[PDB]
mmCIF file of all heavy atoms in Angstrom:
data_model
loop_
_atom_site.group_PDB
_atom_site.id
_atom_site.type_symbol
_atom_site.label_atom_id
_atom_site.label_comp_id
_atom_site.label_asym_id
_atom_site.label_seq_id
_atom_site.Cartn_x
_atom_site.Cartn_y
_atom_site.Cartn_z
ATOM 1 N N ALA M 1 0.897 -1.216 0.014
ATOM 2 C CA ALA M 1 -0.045 -0.083 0.076
ATOM 3 C C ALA M 1 0.856 1.271 0.034
ATOM 4 O O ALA M 1 0.389 2.276 0.532
ATOM 5 C CB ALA M 1 -0.966 0.001 1.245
ATOM 6 N N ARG M 2 2.063 1.121 -0.504
ATOM 7 C CA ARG M 2 2.840 2.345 -0.782
ATOM 8 C C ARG M 2 2.491 2.968 -2.182
ATOM 9 O O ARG M 2 2.146 2.144 -2.997
ATOM 10 C CB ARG M 2 4.458 2.095 -0.661
ATOM 11 C CG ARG M 2 4.713 1.263 0.542
ATOM 12 C CD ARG M 2 4.528 2.119 1.836
ATOM 13 N NE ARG M 2 5.051 1.402 3.050
ATOM 14 C CZ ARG M 2 5.144 1.868 4.287
ATOM 15 N NH1 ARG M 2 4.643 3.072 4.412
ATOM 16 N NH2 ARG M 2 5.633 1.112 5.196
ATOM 17 N N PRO M 3 2.834 4.181 -2.435
ATOM 18 C CA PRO M 3 2.712 4.756 -3.662
ATOM 19 C C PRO M 3 3.643 4.093 -4.768
ATOM 20 O O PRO M 3 3.182 3.873 -5.884
ATOM 21 C CB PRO M 3 3.151 6.162 -3.561
ATOM 22 C CG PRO M 3 2.898 6.600 -2.037
ATOM 23 C CD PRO M 3 3.116 5.230 -1.295
ATOM 24 N N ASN M 4 4.719 3.755 -4.412
ATOM 25 C CA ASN M 4 5.802 3.062 -5.160
ATOM 26 C C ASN M 4 5.858 1.616 -4.845
ATOM 27 O O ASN M 4 5.646 1.090 -3.721
ATOM 28 C CB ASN M 4 7.192 3.643 -4.723
ATOM 29 C CG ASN M 4 7.457 3.705 -3.185
ATOM 30 O OD1 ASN M 4 6.596 4.266 -2.401
ATOM 31 N ND2 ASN M 4 8.588 3.176 -2.746
ATOM 32 N N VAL M 5 5.870 0.795 -6.026
ATOM 33 C CA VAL M 5 5.862 -0.633 -5.896
ATOM 34 C C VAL M 5 7.311 -1.132 -5.396
ATOM 35 O O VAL M 5 8.220 -0.514 -5.529
ATOM 36 C CB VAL M 5 5.462 -1.383 -7.121
ATOM 37 C CG1 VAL M 5 4.232 -0.871 -7.668
ATOM 38 C CG2 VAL M 5 6.617 -1.256 -8.114
ATOM 39 N N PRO M 6 7.238 -2.289 -4.683
ATOM 40 C CA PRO M 6 8.546 -2.933 -4.212
ATOM 41 C C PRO M 6 9.415 -3.112 -5.381
ATOM 42 O O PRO M 6 8.895 -3.484 -6.465
ATOM 43 C CB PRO M 6 8.171 -4.085 -3.374
ATOM 44 C CG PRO M 6 6.743 -4.017 -3.026
ATOM 45 C CD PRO M 6 6.236 -3.226 -4.117
ATOM 46 N N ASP M 7 10.741 -2.895 -5.169
ATOM 47 C CA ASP M 7 11.735 -3.126 -6.208
ATOM 48 C C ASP M 7 11.874 -4.582 -6.635
ATOM 49 O O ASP M 7 12.028 -5.036 -7.735
ATOM 50 C CB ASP M 7 13.028 -2.492 -5.782
ATOM 51 C CG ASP M 7 13.000 -1.033 -5.704
ATOM 52 O OD1 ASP M 7 12.539 -0.441 -6.601
ATOM 53 O OD2 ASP M 7 13.437 -0.512 -4.622
ATOM 54 N N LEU M 8 11.652 -5.530 -5.659
ATOM 55 C CA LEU M 8 11.570 -6.926 -5.791
ATOM 56 C C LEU M 8 10.535 -7.535 -4.988
ATOM 57 O O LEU M 8 10.041 -7.042 -3.906
ATOM 58 C CB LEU M 8 12.888 -7.622 -5.360
ATOM 59 C CG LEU M 8 14.319 -7.224 -5.873
ATOM 60 C CD1 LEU M 8 14.853 -6.213 -5.011
ATOM 61 C CD2 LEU M 8 15.243 -8.251 -6.204
ATOM 62 N N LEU M 9 9.888 -8.666 -5.413
ATOM 63 C CA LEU M 9 9.187 -9.604 -4.716
ATOM 64 C C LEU M 9 9.968 -10.765 -4.235
ATOM 65 O O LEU M 9 10.635 -11.478 -5.234
ATOM 66 C CB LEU M 9 7.866 -9.993 -5.317
ATOM 67 C CG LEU M 9 6.874 -8.896 -6.033
ATOM 68 C CD1 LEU M 9 5.823 -9.615 -6.542
ATOM 69 C CD2 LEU M 9 6.538 -7.809 -4.875
ATOM 70 N N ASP M 10 10.042 -11.070 -2.930
ATOM 71 C CA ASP M 10 10.704 -12.189 -2.453
ATOM 72 C C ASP M 10 9.678 -13.291 -2.200
ATOM 73 O O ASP M 10 8.919 -13.280 -1.329
ATOM 74 C CB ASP M 10 11.428 -11.752 -1.094
ATOM 75 C CG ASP M 10 12.076 -12.919 -0.475
ATOM 76 O OD1 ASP M 10 11.972 -14.112 -0.813
ATOM 77 O OD2 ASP M 10 12.974 -12.707 0.370
ATOM 78 N N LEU M 11 9.732 -14.173 -3.169
ATOM 79 C CA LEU M 11 8.621 -15.205 -3.099
ATOM 80 C C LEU M 11 8.858 -16.264 -2.067
ATOM 81 O O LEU M 11 7.942 -17.239 -1.671
ATOM 82 C CB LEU M 11 8.499 -15.905 -4.441
ATOM 83 C CG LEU M 11 8.289 -15.031 -5.735
ATOM 84 C CD1 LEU M 11 8.132 -15.759 -6.951
ATOM 85 C CD2 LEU M 11 7.100 -14.084 -5.336
ATOM 86 N N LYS M 12 10.188 -16.358 -1.483
ATOM 87 C CA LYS M 12 10.494 -17.409 -0.300
ATOM 88 C C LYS M 12 9.908 -16.767 0.980
ATOM 89 O O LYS M 12 9.151 -17.479 1.618
ATOM 90 C CB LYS M 12 11.751 -17.626 -0.325
ATOM 91 C CG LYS M 12 12.281 -18.427 0.879
ATOM 92 C CD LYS M 12 13.835 -18.427 0.957
ATOM 93 C CE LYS M 12 14.412 -19.297 2.171
ATOM 94 N NZ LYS M 12 15.714 -19.120 2.271
ATOM 95 N N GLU M 13 10.283 -15.680 1.248
ATOM 96 C CA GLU M 13 9.866 -14.969 2.458
ATOM 97 C C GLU M 13 8.612 -14.246 2.469
ATOM 98 O O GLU M 13 7.959 -13.909 3.510
ATOM 99 C CB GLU M 13 11.069 -13.934 2.858
ATOM 100 C CG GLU M 13 12.312 -14.595 3.186
ATOM 101 C CD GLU M 13 12.228 -15.605 4.349
ATOM 102 O OE1 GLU M 13 11.425 -15.455 5.098
ATOM 103 O OE2 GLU M 13 13.254 -16.463 4.249
ATOM 104 N N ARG M 14 8.016 -14.086 1.221
ATOM 105 C CA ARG M 14 6.637 -13.408 1.003
ATOM 106 C C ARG M 14 6.800 -11.907 1.546
ATOM 107 O O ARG M 14 5.985 -11.538 2.308
ATOM 108 C CB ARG M 14 5.558 -14.041 1.672
ATOM 109 C CG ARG M 14 5.413 -15.653 1.451
ATOM 110 C CD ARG M 14 4.922 -15.823 0.029
ATOM 111 N NE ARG M 14 3.522 -15.237 0.008
ATOM 112 C CZ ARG M 14 2.854 -15.046 -1.147
ATOM 113 N NH1 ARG M 14 3.354 -15.430 -2.267
ATOM 114 N NH2 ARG M 14 1.661 -14.477 -1.033
ATOM 115 N N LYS M 15 7.746 -11.273 1.013
ATOM 116 C CA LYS M 15 7.969 -9.948 1.367
ATOM 117 C C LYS M 15 8.231 -9.100 0.086
ATOM 118 O O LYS M 15 8.691 -9.658 -1.033
ATOM 119 C CB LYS M 15 9.385 -9.749 2.152
ATOM 120 C CG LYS M 15 9.551 -10.612 3.408
ATOM 121 C CD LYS M 15 8.893 -10.063 4.652
ATOM 122 C CE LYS M 15 8.923 -10.777 5.777
ATOM 123 N NZ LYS M 15 8.107 -10.401 6.847
ATOM 124 N N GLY M 16 7.992 -7.709 0.059
ATOM 125 C CA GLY M 16 8.224 -6.832 -0.832
ATOM 126 C C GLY M 16 9.628 -6.221 -0.354
ATOM 127 O O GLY M 16 9.673 -5.748 0.754
ATOM 128 N N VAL M 17 10.463 -6.139 -1.274
ATOM 129 C CA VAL M 17 11.887 -5.518 -1.018
ATOM 130 C C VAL M 17 12.052 -4.231 -1.720
ATOM 131 O O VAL M 17 11.883 -4.138 -2.854
ATOM 132 C CB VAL M 17 13.023 -6.579 -1.571
ATOM 133 C CG1 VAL M 17 14.337 -6.059 -1.058
ATOM 134 C CG2 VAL M 17 12.787 -7.868 -0.806
ATOM 135 N N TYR M 18 12.494 -3.230 -1.016
ATOM 136 C CA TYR M 18 12.854 -1.886 -1.446
ATOM 137 C C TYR M 18 14.315 -1.659 -1.352
ATOM 138 O O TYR M 18 14.804 -2.134 -0.313
ATOM 139 C CB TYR M 18 12.102 -0.805 -0.730
ATOM 140 C CG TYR M 18 10.602 -1.036 -0.721
ATOM 141 C CD1 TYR M 18 9.905 -1.725 0.194
ATOM 142 C CD2 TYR M 18 9.844 -0.227 -1.588
ATOM 143 C CE1 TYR M 18 8.640 -1.919 0.471
ATOM 144 C CE2 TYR M 18 8.302 -0.476 -1.507
ATOM 145 C CZ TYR M 18 7.800 -1.220 -0.460
ATOM 146 O OH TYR M 18 6.493 -1.475 -0.333
ATOM 147 N N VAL M 19 14.936 -1.191 -2.424
ATOM 148 C CA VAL M 19 16.447 -0.957 -2.262
ATOM 149 C C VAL M 19 16.700 0.429 -2.369
ATOM 150 O O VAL M 19 16.190 1.337 -3.163
ATOM 151 C CB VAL M 19 17.115 -1.606 -3.536
ATOM 152 C CG1 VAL M 19 18.582 -1.345 -3.492
ATOM 153 C CG2 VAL M 19 16.794 -3.111 -3.571
ATOM 154 N N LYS M 20 17.515 0.863 -1.301
ATOM 155 C CA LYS M 20 17.991 2.272 -1.245
ATOM 156 C C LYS M 20 19.617 2.224 -1.244
ATOM 157 O O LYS M 20 20.140 1.593 -0.397
ATOM 158 C CB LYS M 20 17.425 2.966 0.021
ATOM 159 C CG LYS M 20 15.789 3.154 -0.026
ATOM 160 C CD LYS M 20 15.351 4.249 1.004
ATOM 161 C CE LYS M 20 13.742 4.579 0.735
ATOM 162 N NZ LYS M 20 13.371 5.809 1.531
ATOM 163 N N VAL M 21 20.148 3.140 -2.097
ATOM 164 C CA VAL M 21 21.563 3.315 -2.214
ATOM 165 C C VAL M 21 21.884 4.814 -1.565
ATOM 166 O O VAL M 21 21.385 5.781 -2.024
ATOM 167 C CB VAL M 21 22.013 3.206 -3.591
ATOM 168 C CG1 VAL M 21 23.511 3.641 -3.703
ATOM 169 C CG2 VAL M 21 21.799 1.957 -4.202
ATOM 170 N N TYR M 22 22.644 4.696 -0.647
ATOM 171 C CA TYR M 22 23.175 5.982 0.104
ATOM 172 C C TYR M 22 24.570 6.322 -0.528
ATOM 173 O O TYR M 22 25.320 5.533 -0.387
ATOM 174 C CB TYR M 22 23.252 5.597 1.525
ATOM 175 C CG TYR M 22 21.843 5.331 2.292
ATOM 176 C CD1 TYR M 22 21.153 4.199 1.941
ATOM 177 C CD2 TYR M 22 21.314 6.379 3.063
ATOM 178 C CE1 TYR M 22 19.949 3.995 2.633
ATOM 179 C CE2 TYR M 22 19.975 6.190 3.591
ATOM 180 C CZ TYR M 22 19.278 4.963 3.353
ATOM 181 O OH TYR M 22 18.168 4.722 3.921
ATOM 182 N N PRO M 23 24.759 7.394 -1.282
ATOM 183 C CA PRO M 23 26.009 8.005 -1.542
ATOM 184 C C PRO M 23 26.564 8.423 0.052
ATOM 185 O O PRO M 23 25.973 9.144 0.620
ATOM 186 C CB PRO M 23 25.784 9.288 -2.323
ATOM 187 C CG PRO M 23 24.314 9.058 -2.957
ATOM 188 C CD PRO M 23 23.670 8.188 -1.919
ATOM 189 N N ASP M 24 27.511 7.602 0.566
ATOM 190 C CA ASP M 24 27.612 7.536 1.939
ATOM 191 C C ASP M 24 28.948 7.116 2.268
ATOM 192 O O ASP M 24 29.224 5.976 2.136
ATOM 193 C CB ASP M 24 26.513 6.584 2.298
ATOM 194 C CG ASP M 24 26.336 6.494 3.858
ATOM 195 O OD1 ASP M 24 26.817 7.413 4.628
ATOM 196 O OD2 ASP M 24 25.419 5.665 4.367
ATOM 197 N N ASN M 25 29.592 8.082 3.069
ATOM 198 C CA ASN M 25 30.637 7.574 3.990
ATOM 199 C C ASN M 25 29.705 7.275 5.074
ATOM 200 O O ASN M 25 29.040 8.077 5.690
ATOM 201 C CB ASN M 25 31.695 8.625 4.250
ATOM 202 C CG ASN M 25 31.619 9.306 5.643
ATOM 203 O OD1 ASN M 25 31.051 10.378 5.536
ATOM 204 N ND2 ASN M 25 32.017 8.620 6.677
ATOM 205 N N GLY M 26 29.613 6.007 5.534
ATOM 206 C CA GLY M 26 28.759 5.571 6.703
ATOM 207 C C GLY M 26 27.837 4.347 6.429
ATOM 208 O O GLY M 26 27.777 4.005 5.317
ATOM 209 N N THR M 27 27.351 3.900 7.509
ATOM 210 C CA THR M 27 26.378 2.741 7.580
ATOM 211 C C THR M 27 24.878 3.185 7.632
ATOM 212 O O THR M 27 24.632 4.046 8.643
ATOM 213 C CB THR M 27 26.557 1.772 8.626
ATOM 214 O OG1 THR M 27 27.974 1.320 8.513
ATOM 215 C CG2 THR M 27 25.734 0.420 8.527
ATOM 216 N N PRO M 28 23.988 2.818 6.724
ATOM 217 C CA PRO M 28 22.597 3.445 6.841
ATOM 218 C C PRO M 28 21.962 2.764 8.063
ATOM 219 O O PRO M 28 22.144 1.796 8.623
ATOM 220 C CB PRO M 28 22.005 2.764 5.520
ATOM 221 C CG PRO M 28 23.147 2.602 4.687
ATOM 222 C CD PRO M 28 24.272 2.130 5.521
ATOM 223 N N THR M 29 21.080 3.731 8.471
ATOM 224 C CA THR M 29 20.158 3.464 9.658
ATOM 225 C C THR M 29 18.855 2.831 9.165
ATOM 226 O O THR M 29 18.200 3.240 8.388
ATOM 227 C CB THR M 29 19.834 4.729 10.426
ATOM 228 O OG1 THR M 29 21.160 5.465 10.636
ATOM 229 C CG2 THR M 29 19.094 4.500 11.773
ATOM 230 N N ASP M 30 18.435 1.821 9.969
ATOM 231 C CA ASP M 30 17.116 1.203 9.740
ATOM 232 C C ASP M 30 15.999 1.915 10.432
ATOM 233 O O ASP M 30 16.144 2.446 11.583
ATOM 234 C CB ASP M 30 17.138 -0.263 10.244
ATOM 235 C CG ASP M 30 18.040 -1.140 9.448
ATOM 236 O OD1 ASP M 30 17.938 -1.067 8.153
ATOM 237 O OD2 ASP M 30 18.968 -1.689 10.093
ATOM 238 N N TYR M 31 14.923 1.974 9.775
ATOM 239 C CA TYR M 31 13.612 2.792 10.238
ATOM 240 C C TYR M 31 12.619 1.857 10.093
ATOM 241 O O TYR M 31 12.612 1.055 9.091
ATOM 242 C CB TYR M 31 13.477 4.122 9.642
ATOM 243 C CG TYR M 31 14.563 5.147 10.088
ATOM 244 C CD1 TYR M 31 15.547 5.573 9.092
ATOM 245 C CD2 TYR M 31 14.641 5.581 11.410
ATOM 246 C CE1 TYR M 31 16.474 6.615 9.478
ATOM 247 C CE2 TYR M 31 15.722 6.445 11.711
ATOM 248 C CZ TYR M 31 16.522 6.929 10.733
ATOM 249 O OH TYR M 31 17.559 7.875 11.169
ATOM 250 N N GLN M 32 11.429 1.920 10.683
ATOM 251 C CA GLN M 32 10.295 1.013 10.663
ATOM 252 C C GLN M 32 9.728 0.824 9.213
ATOM 253 O O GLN M 32 9.721 1.762 8.328
ATOM 254 C CB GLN M 32 9.076 1.667 11.564
ATOM 255 C CG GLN M 32 8.009 0.644 11.765
ATOM 256 C CD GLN M 32 6.712 1.394 12.425
ATOM 257 O OE1 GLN M 32 6.643 2.643 12.444
ATOM 258 N NE2 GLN M 32 5.735 0.578 12.961
ATOM 259 N N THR M 33 9.474 -0.361 8.962
ATOM 260 C CA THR M 33 8.724 -0.796 7.774
ATOM 261 C C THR M 33 7.443 -1.642 8.127
ATOM 262 O O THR M 33 7.420 -2.182 9.371
ATOM 263 C CB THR M 33 9.674 -1.627 6.806
ATOM 264 O OG1 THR M 33 10.070 -2.822 7.394
ATOM 265 C CG2 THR M 33 10.825 -0.711 6.410
ATOM 266 N N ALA M 34 6.524 -2.047 7.352
ATOM 267 C CA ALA M 34 5.480 -2.875 7.446
ATOM 268 C C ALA M 34 5.971 -4.349 7.589
ATOM 269 O O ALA M 34 7.017 -4.637 7.273
ATOM 270 C CB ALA M 34 4.457 -2.771 6.402
ATOM 271 N N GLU M 35 5.081 -5.281 8.240
ATOM 272 C CA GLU M 35 5.489 -6.573 8.403
ATOM 273 C C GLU M 35 5.870 -7.342 7.132
ATOM 274 O O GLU M 35 6.704 -8.234 7.245
ATOM 275 C CB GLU M 35 4.364 -7.246 9.293
ATOM 276 C CG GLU M 35 3.129 -7.606 8.385
ATOM 277 C CD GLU M 35 1.978 -8.355 9.239
ATOM 278 O OE1 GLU M 35 2.424 -8.997 10.262
ATOM 279 O OE2 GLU M 35 0.852 -8.306 8.773
ATOM 280 N N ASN M 36 5.239 -7.083 6.013
ATOM 281 C CA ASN M 36 5.538 -7.647 4.788
ATOM 282 C C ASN M 36 6.599 -7.010 3.932
ATOM 283 O O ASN M 36 6.726 -7.334 2.641
ATOM 284 C CB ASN M 36 4.224 -8.026 3.879
ATOM 285 C CG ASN M 36 3.621 -6.757 3.280
ATOM 286 O OD1 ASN M 36 3.851 -5.652 3.756
ATOM 287 N ND2 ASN M 36 2.610 -6.953 2.512
ATOM 288 N N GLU M 37 7.269 -6.155 4.460
ATOM 289 C CA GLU M 37 8.290 -5.326 3.736
ATOM 290 C C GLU M 37 9.737 -5.527 4.265
ATOM 291 O O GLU M 37 9.913 -5.622 5.534
ATOM 292 C CB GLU M 37 7.938 -3.708 3.807
ATOM 293 C CG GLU M 37 6.644 -3.381 3.090
ATOM 294 C CD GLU M 37 6.297 -1.948 3.272
ATOM 295 O OE1 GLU M 37 6.635 -1.348 4.230
ATOM 296 O OE2 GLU M 37 5.754 -1.362 2.346
ATOM 297 N N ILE M 38 10.716 -5.335 3.422
ATOM 298 C CA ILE M 38 12.114 -5.390 3.740
ATOM 299 C C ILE M 38 12.645 -4.200 2.993
ATOM 300 O O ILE M 38 12.592 -3.988 1.726
ATOM 301 C CB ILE M 38 12.967 -6.691 3.398
ATOM 302 C CG1 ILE M 38 12.301 -7.806 4.118
ATOM 303 C CG2 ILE M 38 14.464 -6.501 3.518
ATOM 304 C CD1 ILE M 38 12.638 -7.908 5.610
ATOM 305 N N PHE M 39 13.495 -3.405 3.696
ATOM 306 C CA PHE M 39 14.262 -2.268 3.032
ATOM 307 C C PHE M 39 15.756 -2.519 3.083
ATOM 308 O O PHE M 39 16.256 -2.431 4.146
ATOM 309 C CB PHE M 39 13.806 -0.921 3.788
ATOM 310 C CG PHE M 39 12.520 -0.292 3.499
ATOM 311 C CD1 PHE M 39 11.377 -0.924 3.860
ATOM 312 C CD2 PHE M 39 12.463 0.981 2.684
ATOM 313 C CE1 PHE M 39 10.105 -0.359 3.509
ATOM 314 C CE2 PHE M 39 11.225 1.529 2.394
ATOM 315 C CZ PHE M 39 10.094 0.767 2.844
ATOM 316 N N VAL M 40 16.166 -2.963 1.966
ATOM 317 C CA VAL M 40 17.690 -3.099 1.828
ATOM 318 C C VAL M 40 18.343 -1.730 1.656
ATOM 319 O O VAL M 40 17.915 -0.938 0.707
ATOM 320 C CB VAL M 40 18.054 -3.961 0.433
ATOM 321 C CG1 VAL M 40 19.393 -3.863 0.019
ATOM 322 C CG2 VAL M 40 17.661 -5.395 0.788
ATOM 323 N N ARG M 41 19.292 -1.366 2.520
ATOM 324 C CA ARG M 41 19.891 -0.156 2.630
ATOM 325 C C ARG M 41 21.413 -0.294 2.675
ATOM 326 O O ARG M 41 21.954 -0.833 3.564
ATOM 327 C CB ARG M 41 19.443 0.601 3.976
ATOM 328 C CG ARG M 41 18.011 1.210 3.864
ATOM 329 C CD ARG M 41 17.657 1.896 5.163
ATOM 330 N NE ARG M 41 16.573 2.837 5.091
ATOM 331 C CZ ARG M 41 15.286 2.669 5.693
ATOM 332 N NH1 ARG M 41 15.071 1.603 6.491
ATOM 333 N NH2 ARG M 41 14.409 3.729 5.759
ATOM 334 N N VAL M 42 22.005 0.257 1.519
ATOM 335 C CA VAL M 42 23.502 0.016 1.371
ATOM 336 C C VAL M 42 24.158 1.299 0.977
ATOM 337 O O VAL M 42 23.497 2.256 0.305
ATOM 338 C CB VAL M 42 23.680 -1.017 0.212
ATOM 339 C CG1 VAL M 42 23.095 -2.403 0.573
ATOM 340 C CG2 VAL M 42 23.118 -0.606 -1.141
ATOM 341 N N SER M 43 25.335 1.463 1.297
ATOM 342 C CA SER M 43 26.079 2.691 0.930
ATOM 343 C C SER M 43 26.930 2.468 -0.235
ATOM 344 O O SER M 43 27.258 1.348 -0.605
ATOM 345 C CB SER M 43 26.937 3.143 2.087
ATOM 346 O OG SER M 43 28.187 2.389 2.262
#
């Protein structure tokens, strides 16, 4: 129920996966998602 569709569907875990790339010296911080969502966060 987000405006944007997940970047991937994980058919094993039954999750929608969103990928975010941080131009980033540093490690990304995790923030709350829904139970059926995973946010992959990489620098």
Side-chain angles (χ1 to χ4, degrees):
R2 307 297 183 171
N4 48 307
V5 307
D7 299 304
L8 313 87
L9 306 182
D10 177 344
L11 307 185
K12 174 188 178 186
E13 297 300 333
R14 310 284 302 171
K15 303 281 175 189
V17 182
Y18 303 86
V19 176
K20 295 197 167 193
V21 178
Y22 291 77
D24 188 5
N25 102 261
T27 310
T29 308
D30 299 305
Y31 295 108
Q32 191 190 16
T33 64
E35 70 181 340
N36 71 349
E37 297 177 327
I38 296 290
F39 281 67
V40 163
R41 285 179 159 115
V42 298
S43 79

